[PDB]
DNA sequence: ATAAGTCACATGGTGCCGAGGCCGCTCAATTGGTCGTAGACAGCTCTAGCACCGCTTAAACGCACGTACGCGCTGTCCCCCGCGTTTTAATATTAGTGTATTTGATTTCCGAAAGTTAAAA
């Protein structure tokens, strides 16, 4: 069942209570990011911890924007999330837009 | 027979070994006590409130009604993905070095405090 199996895992990584992406990339993604900000000269460690807590809000914020822009595709009467759509609804939630 | 003497006996006491029983030192933060000052207050006066009428006619609400407008309608286009598959790169292990932090001893730093006075509607 597509449909079935599809949903029961929405509901079991909805009830999941832990971070879900891939970590060694993140951790490598968050690291060049802040090589690329620093400079020639000065570079900056990062430890478990700070990353940690980097990855939940990064997670949290891309969960409540996922429902979101869910939301508004579901207001377009599909289920299809777009790049409008989606960027709409960041947009509208107003930061970083 | 008995003062000397040997002797064993009997009790003394001196020495060492745990050990259970008091003790000693320190730091928490309480509470005890005490200055000095925020706090509530002591007559108070007047502010902008908020009625309290007393008008007017500018909004406004309904009376009419009308295109605009919606809202499902409907062929059909399309696209998302449910997988199925090869990839594919995400594991998650050791690692020592290379600063990263780091915590002592100062050692200057500097602005709160105490005068002294500049300035200030």
């Given amino acids: 069942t597509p449909s079935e199996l599809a949903l029961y895992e929405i509901r079991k990584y909805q009830r999941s209570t832990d971070l879900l992406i891939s970590k ?40 409540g924007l996922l429902e979101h822009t869910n939301l508004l595709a579901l207001h377009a009467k599909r289920i299809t999330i777009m790049k409008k759509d989606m960027q709409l609804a960041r947009r509208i939630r107003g930061q970083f837009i």
């Fill in 24 to 63: 060694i990339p993140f951790a490598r993604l968050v690291k060049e990011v802040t090589d690329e900000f620093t400079t020639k000269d000065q570079d900056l460690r990062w430890q478990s911890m700070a990353i940690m807590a980097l990855q939940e809000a990064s997670e949290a914020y891309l969960v």
